[PDB]
């Protein structure tokens, strides 16, 4: 029947209008988010410069552990839907980190941001210790601050806790921290990138401002906010990349809907012509049969 | 249940009453399976339905 064809046609029209509206909102969002990330950049540059200046002359976080046994990992994902492969890519990277860790033999400790990655982990029976949720593509310093506080508190409880031994630090110590997030460097494409935070190395290059003779306190007060700034930048990059991917996917959806509408219209037209011919043939045969 | 299952698809969150209704409907649908050439007496029928 052609009634189903008409229903499909109107539904496809509705979905294509929704798609164009969504993609226009998305491109406006990327336009307004590029400004925010580029405005956040200079403060990060200043923080990096002052940290490098402090490190120029003069901290368990900067001292490697004798025998690592565990490793902590962070995953970030979009809280909403309609983002093509955006979560798939970061989950692929997480899986290959897991493979590398199995090769090294160090057990992972999972941390998740966003509903999609939590849902994926639920079906595969992988334990999650802490799941932050509440992102809506627009981050703020509060979420980054609390996440950084929790992670730095957790890692500091891994020194006297030599893995299996629940020492003075307490159980669930972690020897290495890693980050997985989507990096946005150009509008054409974006690539998922892994990283590490807790292990560090000092880079030496060839070559007055001063303070009281306590630089260790300055380092211990600057490192947690360094991690907070790093995760803040990661969140901004993730938001920008998610918005761009949403734009691309929505455009593809519209370009997939239009030709389907055309094909349905053609089928409906041929069906109508066939029907007309059928009844006219039947009536003329009945008439001239007398 | 058959009318509600379609609506429940692609739903982020559902109430406990709704999911209980889905569970009961699934159990009821499962119970009604029957192989060929397996006649059942009325007494066993009413016992199974109860």
């Amino acid at each position: 029947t052609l009634r189903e064809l008409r229903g499909r046609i109107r539904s496809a029209g509705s979905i294509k209008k929704i798609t164009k509206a969504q993609e226009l909102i998305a491109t406006s969002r990327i336009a307004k988010a590029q400004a925010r990330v580029e405005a956040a950049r200079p403060y990060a540059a200043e923080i990096t410069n002052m940290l490098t200046e402090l490190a120029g002359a003069s901290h368990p976080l900067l001292v490697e552990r004798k025998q690592p046994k565990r490793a902590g990992v962070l995953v970030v994902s979009s809280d909403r839907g309609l983002c093509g492969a955006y979560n798939a890519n970061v989950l692929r990277r997480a899986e290959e980190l897991f493979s590398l860790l199995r090769d090294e033999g160090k057990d992972p400790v999972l941390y998740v941001v966003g509903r999609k990655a939590l849902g994926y982990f639920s079906f595969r029976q992988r334990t999650v210790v802490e799941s932050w949720t509440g992102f809506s593509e627009r981050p703020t310093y509060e979420n980054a601050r609390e996440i950084a506080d929790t992670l730095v508190n957790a890692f500091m409880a891994g020194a006297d806790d030599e893995g299996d031994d629940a020492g003075a630090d307490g159980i669930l110590g972690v020897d290495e921290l890693h980050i997985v997030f989507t990096e946005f460097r150009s509008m054409l494409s974006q690539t998922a990138v892994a990283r590490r935070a807790a292990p560090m190395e000092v880079e030496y290059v060839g070559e007055l401002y001063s303070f009281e003779p306590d630089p260790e306190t300055l380092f211990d007060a600057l490192l947690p906010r360094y991690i907070a700034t790093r995760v803040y930048a990661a969140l901004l990059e993730a938001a920008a990349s998610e918005s761009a991917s949403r734009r691309r996917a929505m455009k593809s959806a519209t370009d997939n809907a239009d030709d389907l509408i055309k094909a349905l219209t053609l089928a409906a037209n041929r069906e109508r012509q066939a029907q007309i011919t059928q009844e006219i043939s039947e009536i003329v045969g009945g008439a001239n049969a007398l | 249940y058959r009318e509600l299952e379609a609506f429940a698809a692609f739903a982020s969150d559902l109430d406990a009453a709704s999911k209980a209704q889905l569970d009961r409907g699934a159990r009821l649908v499962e119970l009604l399976k029957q192989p060929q050439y397996s006649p059942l007496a009325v007494e066993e029928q009413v016992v199974a339905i109860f």
Partner: peptide
């Protein structure tokens, strides 16, 4: 019937990149 159900229910088993800090001091 409910007594029999309760009796039988207990007797049945269930089948189921890296980061680096920058220091201006010449290398030791």
């Amino acid at each position: 019937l409910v007594s029999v159900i309760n009796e039988f229910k207990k007797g049945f088993q269930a089948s189921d990149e890296k980061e680096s800090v920058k220091v201006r001091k010449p290398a030791p």
